[PDB]
Amino acid sequence: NDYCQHFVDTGHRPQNFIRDELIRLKDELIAKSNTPPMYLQADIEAFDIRELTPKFDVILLEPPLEEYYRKCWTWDDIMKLEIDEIAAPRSFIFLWCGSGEGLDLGRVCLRKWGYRRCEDICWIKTNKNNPLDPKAVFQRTKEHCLMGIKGTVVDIDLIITEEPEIGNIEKPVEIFHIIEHFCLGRRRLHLFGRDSTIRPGWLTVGPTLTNSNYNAETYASYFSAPNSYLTGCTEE
Amino acid sequence: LFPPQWICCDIRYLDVSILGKFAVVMADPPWDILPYGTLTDDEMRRLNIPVLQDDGFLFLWVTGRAMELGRECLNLWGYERVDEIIWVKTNQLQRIIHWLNHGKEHCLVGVKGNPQGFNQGLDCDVIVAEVRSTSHKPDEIYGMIERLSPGTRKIELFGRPHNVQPNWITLGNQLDGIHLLDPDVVARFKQRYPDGIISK
Numbered sequence: 370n371d372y373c374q375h376f377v378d379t380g381h382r383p384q385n386f387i388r389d390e391l392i393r394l395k396d397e398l399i400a401k402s403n404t405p406p407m408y409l410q411a412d413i414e415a416f417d418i419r420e421l422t423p424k425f426d427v428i429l430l431e432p433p434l435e436e437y438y439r440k441c442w443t444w445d446d447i448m449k450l451e452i453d454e455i456a457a458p459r460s461f462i463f464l465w466c467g468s469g470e471g472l473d474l475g476r477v478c479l480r481k482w483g484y485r486r487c488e489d490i491c492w493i494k495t496n497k498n499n500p501l502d503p504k505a506v507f508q509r510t511k512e513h514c515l516m517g518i519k520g521t522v523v524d525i526d527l528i529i530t531e532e533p534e535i536g537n538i539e540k541p542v543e544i545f546h547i548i549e550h551f552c553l554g555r556r557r558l559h560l561f562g563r564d565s566t567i568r569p570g571w572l573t574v575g576p577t578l579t580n581s582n583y584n585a586e587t588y589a590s591y592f593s594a595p596n597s598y599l600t601g602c603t604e605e
Numbered sequence: 606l607f608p609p610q611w612i613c614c615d616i617r618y619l620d621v622s623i624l625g626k627f628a629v630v631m632a633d634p635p636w637d638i639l640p641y642g643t644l645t646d647d648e649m650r651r652l653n654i655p656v657l658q659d660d661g662f663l664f665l666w667v668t669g670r671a672m673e674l675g676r677e678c679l680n681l682w683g684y685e686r687v688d689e690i691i692w693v694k695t696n697q698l699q700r701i702i703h704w705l706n707h708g709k710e711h712c713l714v715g716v717k718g719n720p721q722g723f724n725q726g727l728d729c730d731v732i733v734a735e736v737r738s739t740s741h742k743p744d745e746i747y748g749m750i751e752r753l754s755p756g757t758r759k760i761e762l763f764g765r766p767h768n769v770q771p772n773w774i775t776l777g778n779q780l781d782g783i784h785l786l787d788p789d790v791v792a793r794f795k796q797r798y799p800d801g802i803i804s805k
């Protein structure tokens with residue numbers, strides 16, 4: 370059965386026809402391990418990234434690409450971010466790259482900041498409820514989130530959800546589950562988050578946040594000894 | 606000449622200038638990521654892809670670190686990557702099969718020159734199709750490529766016998782012999798290889 374031909378026929382994207390012991394104790398540990406949510410309004414263009422301490426175990430980077438709209442950030446602006454200055458020597462990055470040139474420029478960013486890509490995570494958008502870039506050859510129905518590692522050392526690499534309403538730039542919350550199940554550590558930073566993405570276990574920094582509670586020394590106290598090397602998948 | 610054609614050969618050593626120009630090139634390389642006909646990164650970089658097209662498209666299957674290396678070759682060979690196809694691998698019940706389990710294979714899409722008359726935008730960049738033998742890409746890729754550029758000449762590198770298609774020329778060292786029907790190609794092959802052997 371040809372779903373590419375079906376899509377040509379009917380406009381139902383092939384991903385519409387993808388169907389479907391506990392993995393829930395893990396979740397409960399993540400939740401109890403989680404630091405309070407912390408968050409800071411900051412215009413990242415003008416903001417010295419080094420003020421964000423301590424060094425992070427996980428960085429989730431979600432710059433507002435122009436393609437999401439059909440202030441925007443270009444890959445020119447994103448590349449100039451000094452991500453290496455706030456990443457721990459052994460740490461991870463998750464970069465939402467969209468679907469166009471970001472797939473290449475995001476790999477350049479990752480290398481610029483000292484990571485190598487270990488996973489390519491695809492957010493596949495179904496269109497069950499509503500059956501073009503000039504350089505595009507095909508209709509683009511997915512977005513990529515690249516996973517990078519730097520330093521020495523149960524989930525799939527697909528997220529399938531329905532394509533959001535136009536002008537909805539939100540990424541699936543499923544990405545947070547994938548990240549948190551890795552148990553990479555507890556200093557987690559979400560660059561260009563919003564009020565709507567604030568989440569326990571995470572520091573959120575973005576220009577549209579309406580309130581802040583970030584305090585550098587308060588944040589660092591969450592990881593004082595004996596909590597210094599926890600994975601976030603472990604009892605207090 | 607429209608029916609399937611193929612050449613058993615070592616793609617490293619074949620004089621691909623004899624084959625002419627192609628609207629679409631597809632490659633599924635044995636990347637070093639070795640078992641068993643692996644090409645080294647330099648061997649890949651040195652493949653004479655640039656002679657095969659003037660205007661058109663390249664389809665390049667990548668996995669692991671070849672996601673980066675294939676981006677390198679494609680750029681070195683003179684292409685811009687303008688799309689990336691994802692094949693979601695399913696079983697017969699339409700269910701999905703290092704840090705994450707992999708449920709997809711990637712295929713880079715590159716453009717060279719100023720391809721005109723192609724039906725961009727007919728298909729979308731996600732394939733859902735049942736997995737068959739090990740390796741072995743889904744046949745949906747050929748329908749996608751046919752709808753995109755119908756009737757035109759196409760060449761596939763590192764295909765296996767099951768990969769041979771109408772309008773395509775297939776190269777690989779596990780094809781059975783040489784089978785050429787296009788007259789311009791038969792001519793250039795006989796001149797370049799009067800004894801039918803294909804040495805370094």
Ligand SMILES: CC1(C)CCN(Cc2ccc3c(NC[C@]4(O)CCCN(c5cc(NCc6ccccc6)ncn5)C4)cccc3c2)CC1
Nearest residue numbers: 614615616633634642643666740741742763764777778779
């Ligand atoms: C899942 C996917 C969609 C499909 C699988 N795909 C990976 C993949 C790709 C191709 C495969 C394949 N191709 C047939 C083959 O003949 C195999 C031997 C090498 N080869 C050469 C090599 C060559 N010179 C190099 C040389 C010659 C002699 C000795 C040493 C080196 N010249 C012409 N052909 C191609 C067969 C089996 C599995 C494959 C898997 C991933 C994406």
